[PDB]
Design a protein around this nucleic acid. Structure first.
Ligand SMILES: [Mg+2]
Ligand SMILES: [Mg+2]
Lengths: 53, 285, 163, 41, 237, 41, 42, 127
RNA sequence: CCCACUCGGCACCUUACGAGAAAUCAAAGUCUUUGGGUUCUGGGGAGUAUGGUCGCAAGGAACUUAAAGGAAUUGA
RNA sequence: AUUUGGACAAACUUGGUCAUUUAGAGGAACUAAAAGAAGGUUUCCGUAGGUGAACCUGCGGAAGGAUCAUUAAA
């Protein structure tokens, strides 16, 4: 539930405080080398949790 | 209604063997005398325990998972061997273990090195122990002086015991397959125990194995190593940085070990080094 | 490390010192010789209290526990657990029978030394309790909050049973 | 299914539990534990 | 974390009681800027009252934007440091101490597809005031240029740097600091650098990025008073 | 659950706005299903 | 072995406790007692 | 009639400092942090803690005499991130709401010309 | 700075009347089968066994009823 | 300082004698007992290490690893 602007090596994330931290972790995992498919799976897990609460 | 206590200790939140040949071999190589009480680590479902229970006076099975403990209980209830099994639950590093003659373990690899030394320091330690480690950790126990894998673990474990390889267990034998290869080893703790202080031996080894392929003298060049040895010498006198420097140089030169590498040194070479330091009054620990 | 508390035995024969180095040392009062060292807790000791009638010693720690030591054996008889935070004070009441303790959680817990169980919990404070004084074997107990609030507890077991 | 596990442990007598302190206590939660004079007299 | 669940610390044992409000004993003082600047009033500061107050005052450095001192937004991106040197009746006489730009302005000028030229010189004024000046310049593309970039060869950069160092050295040596500060405000130095280095290569955003004060001579109250442009007491009875 | 990998038509304000104010579409299909069944019968 | 036995034997002469010795692991870091019971009784 | 201070906001990843001082910066007028205003460690960096800290500082500043402030916000800088986080942004909004006049806003994060190695290691950090 | 040209360079885009099974290649091309000069080189992932070779340590006492001889807030 | 003798007298050791709780094993009574899903992880090369190693870690290097948005100006 955020918006991301990827300006070269500079990343900006717009959203709520808890939300941008969640987005930041996924972005950082991608930077560290995690393949996109594995990150996508975790996004589905957190995305599920977000609805129940 | 025991949930109050068992939930206060456990949360009720593994790679299971799938080759009967290794399990039978581990029991066979144990050579359990009929008058031997056996301690069984990582009993699991109970495949290995039941074979041990047949040949042993009593079997103490130490477990950490409450769920697997019930599985062991259900497999042995209402049987002739129920009276000879004592299932223990919980972390067993902290507790004082009973007396056992043989230890057969499908150890969790995380607790490998605490376990190897617990048996060694156990009062009246077991005579033979068949333990299952990973290939890397097992080879370092089995590493001989001058080998690439010779290390502090190799030297420490080889003076309180003798470790000999049994077998290699592949990642296919386990499901889900672990990413590391496994192997079985036997540990024979020496009786009588060598009459050398554990702290003194480990004290010398730690200083000299910081850089195992580096010369022994360079290990003693460190300022912190210089500082600690100075304080130890002061304590010896109580019951001088330049003085301890000279003392170290004489010992290394006379013993003809200062130009040698710890990765190519035997128990005798460390023992000779330890003795020479004691004569000069430097007690490592 | 810094010494936190000092306690004197009933006969003035020994006195104990509690330090933040996780140890309690019992000294012979006449000569100052070290009678024994009590080292079992995992955090620094905030208070030490001799039992005023028999040879027991209570030591309070930052590990959220209180332990009763037998002076004759210098060993931990009973360990009391249940405090959510560090225990700052510990004193014996009702002679050997009970022990009262205060903690940073603001809760005063009355324990049974023999069984080591929390009989009662008094909650009249909203901050840490540094000071705890007892009179007439704990018939009157005063605890001072860090906010500056006093709670003058009065024993009423005899009164309640009559009702 | 955990409650089924708990009842099985309590049912058995040759089971002891370790708290974080390392103490040996039985499933129910009480510390699990001959003298010549007692048996003869 | 002030919660009750927070673990107790050793430092909480003995704590000093707050029994005196510090601002009861503080005394306000007014800061005045040199005559080189249009607006002399640059705020006020406070000190503990003399038991002295002057000792803490002297050596105090305050940094303020030139826009406030000159009353025009054209200097919004430039800051001036002023150091207290003398005190007279709660008036703090200050002197120039340095100059610098805002970080946002510096980041704005630095852009891709152009060359960054920066030059520095350590030089003293006629007042024996040793100072260090930093200059920054960027290449620009001509009106009819079609290339995306406007890079300059290192020979041009070294030629431009030599010209800039000559101008910075010349002006500082042949001027006092009060005169030097008078030059900084209208940015006449930058226009001089533009014309001199222009034939070498067209340039843009030529500025004196920073000014440092490395050394000071013996303090002269007489000179300080002249820069700022004594008083009888009143009988107490 | 399925995660959308395409740009959301709803601006970030709209998603917050919508949640400020089991499924209408699911019930929409239900009504059509009944209509199709009734006509077929 | 006999060399090993002799060296360990001589270590017996030079042996001490290690409670006070700093461990090498630090290298990386760089009236009667109950008279009260009488007065209340009487 | 307008006395100016300097509101120095240091927005770290694990905390937020709101520090108001005189124009020189030698005299502290009020320092409040997110940790002082919250009950849990996890929430020290939260924007909610920052707003409470900013409001507390603003109340103290008005008592002393300060009616306007110059904001000098910064992040950890150095080898770490260079832009103030949401904690710093919340404190800035809180000060504006408090009624204190905001004079000039500048980012003064310590930006190294060149830096020493970061704490992560070769493979990175911030899992 | 602009335009046009010309040498040398890091590269790039579209195509090969060529090559290749293809990915693709200004070379990995030299109009069906072959010669411009010259140097070097060749003939994957899992296991099984070994009449083979070389290496690799330490050390100076069981016994209980098999069993309702039980469980049980749940039973007889 | 130190000595003789006379009473006061703490504290220590000892067998008894009264009071108080209090540990296991028995025996024999009374009372009470209204519940009922799934879910962490890029692949390597050279080198150096490993005692809570189902694998971890330091240094340099490679893709044989999935490029969206803005962007000539005015
Ligand atoms: Mg983090
Ligand atoms: Mg490698």
């Amino acid at each position: 539930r955020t918006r991301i602007v990827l300006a070269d090596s500079k990343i900006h994330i717009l959203g709520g405080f808890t939300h941008i931290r969640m987005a930041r972790e996924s972005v950082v995992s991608l930077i560290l080398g995690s393949p996109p498919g594995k990150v996508y799976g975790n996004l589905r897990t957190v995305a599920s949790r977000l609805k129940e609460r | 209604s025991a949930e109050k206590h068992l939930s206060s200790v456990f949360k009720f939140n593994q790679h299971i063997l799938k080759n009967p040949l290794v399990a039978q071999g581990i029991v066979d190589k144990a050579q359990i005398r009929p008058s031997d009480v056996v301690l069984e680590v990582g009993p699991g479902t109970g495949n290995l325990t039941v074979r041990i229970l047949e040949q042993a006076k009593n079997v103490v099975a130490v477990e950490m998972d409450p769920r697997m403990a019930a599985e062991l209980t259900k497999r042995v209830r209402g049987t002739p061997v129920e009276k000879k099994l004592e299932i223990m639950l919980g972390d067993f590093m902290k507790t004082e273990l009973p007396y056992f003659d043989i230890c057969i373990s499908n150890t969790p690899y995380q607790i490998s090195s605490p376990l190897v030394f617990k048996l060694i320091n156990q009062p009246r330690p077991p005579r033979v122990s068949i333990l299952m480690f990973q290939r890397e950790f097992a080879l370092r126990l089995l590493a001989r002086p001058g080998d690439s894998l010779y290390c502090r673990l190799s030297a420490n474990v080889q003076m309180w015991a003798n470790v000999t390889h049994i077998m290699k267990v592949g990642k296919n034998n386990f499901r889900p397959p672990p990413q590391v290869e496994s192997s079985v080893v036997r540990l024979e703790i020496k009786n009588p125990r060598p009459q050398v202080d554990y702290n003194e031996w480990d004290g010398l080894l730690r200083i000299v194995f910081v850089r195992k392929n580096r010369t022994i003298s360079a290990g003693f060049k460190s300022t912190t190593v210089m500082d600690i040895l100075e304080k130890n010498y002061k304590t010896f006198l109580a019951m001088m940085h330049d003085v301890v420097k000279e003392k170290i140089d004489t010992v290394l030169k006379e013993t003809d070990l200062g130009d040698k590498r710890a990765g190519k040194c035997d128990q005798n070479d460390f023992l000779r080094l330890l003795y020479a330091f004691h004569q000069v009054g430097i007690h490592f620990s | 490390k810094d010494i936190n508390a000092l306690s004197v035995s009933p006969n003035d024969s020994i006195f104990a010192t509690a330090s933040y180095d996780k140890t309690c040392k019992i000294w012979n009062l006449e000569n100052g010789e070290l009678e024994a060292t009590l080292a079992n807790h995992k955090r620094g000791l905030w208070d030490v209290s001799f039992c005023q009638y028999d040879k027991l010693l209570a030591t309070s720690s930052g590990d959220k526990t209180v332990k009763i030591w037998s002076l004759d054996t210098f060993s931990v008889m009973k360990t009391l657990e249940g405090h959510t935070n560090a225990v700052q004070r510990c004193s014996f009441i009702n002679k050997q029978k009970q022990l009262i303790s205060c903690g940073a959680d603001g809760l005063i817990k009355i324990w049974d030394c023999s069984s080591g169980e929390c009989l009662k919990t008094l909650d009249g404070h909203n901050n840490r309790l540094w000071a705890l004084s007892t009179m007439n074997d704990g018939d009157m107990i005063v605890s001072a909050d860090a906010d500056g609030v006093f709670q003058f507890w009065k024993d009423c077991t005899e009164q309640e049973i009559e009702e | 299914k955990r409650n089924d596990v708990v009842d099985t442990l309590s049912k058995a007598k040759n089971i002891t539990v370790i708290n974080q302190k390392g103490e040996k206590k039985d499933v129910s939660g009480k510390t699990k534990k001959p003298d010549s004079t007692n048996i003869k007299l | 974390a002030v919660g009750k669940n927070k673990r107790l610390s050793k430092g909480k044992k003995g704590q000093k009681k707050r029994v005196v409000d510090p601002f009861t004993r503080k005394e306000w003082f007014d800061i005045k800027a040199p005559s080189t600047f249009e607006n002399r009033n640059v705020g006020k500061t406070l000190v503990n009252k003399s038991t002295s107050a002057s000792d803490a005052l002297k050596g105090r450095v305050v940094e303020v934007c030139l826009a406030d001192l000159q009353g025009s937004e054209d200097h919004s991106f430039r800051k001036i440091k002023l150091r207290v040197d003398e005190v007279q009746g709660k008036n703090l006489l200050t002197n120039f101490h340095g100059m610098d730009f805002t970080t946002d302005k510096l980041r704005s000028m630095v852009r891709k597809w152009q060359t960054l030229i920066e030059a520095n010189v350590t030089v003293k004024t006629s007042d024996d005031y040793v100072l260090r000046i930093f200059a920054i310049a960027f290449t620009r593309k001509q009106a009819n240029q079609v290339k995306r970039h406007s890079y300059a060869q290192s020979s041009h950069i070294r030629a431009i740097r030599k010209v800039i160092s000559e101008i910075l050295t010349k002006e500082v040596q042949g001027s006092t600091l009060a005169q030097l500060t008078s030059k900084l405000i209208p940015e006449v130095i930058n226009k001089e650098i533009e014309n001199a280095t222009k034939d070498i290569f067209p340039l843009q955003n030529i500025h004196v990025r920073k000014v440092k004060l490395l050394k000071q001579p013996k303090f002269d109250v007489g000179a300080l008073m002249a820069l700022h442009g004594e008083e009888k007491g009143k009988k107490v009875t | 659950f399925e995660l959308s990998d395409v740009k959301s038509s709803k601006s970030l304000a709209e998603i917050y706005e919508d949640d400020y104010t089991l499924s209408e579409e699911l019930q929409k299909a239900h009504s059509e299903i009944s209509e199709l069944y009734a006509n077929l019968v | 072995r006999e060399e090993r036995k002799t060296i360990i034997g001589k270590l017996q002469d030079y042996k001490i406790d290690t409670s006070l010795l700093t461990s090498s692991k630090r290298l990386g870091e760089g009236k009667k007692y109950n008279w009260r019971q009488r007065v209340e009784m009487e | 009639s307008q006395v100016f201070g300097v509101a120095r906001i240091y927005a770290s990843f694990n905390d937020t400092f709101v520090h108001v001082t005189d124009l020189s910066g030698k005299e502290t007028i009020a320092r409040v942090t997110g940790g002082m205003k919250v009950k849990a460690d996890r929430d020290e960096s939260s924007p909610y803690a920052a707003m409470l800290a900013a409001q507390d500082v603003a109340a103290k500043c008005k008592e002393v005499g300060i009616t306007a402030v110059h904001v000098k916000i910064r992040a950890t800088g150095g080898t770490r991130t260079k832009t103030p986080g949401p904690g710093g942004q919340a404190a800035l909004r809180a000060l504006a709401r408090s009624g204190l006049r905001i004079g000039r806003i500048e980012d003064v994060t310590p930006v190294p010309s060149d830096s020493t190695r970061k704490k992560g290691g070769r493979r990175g950090r911030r899992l």
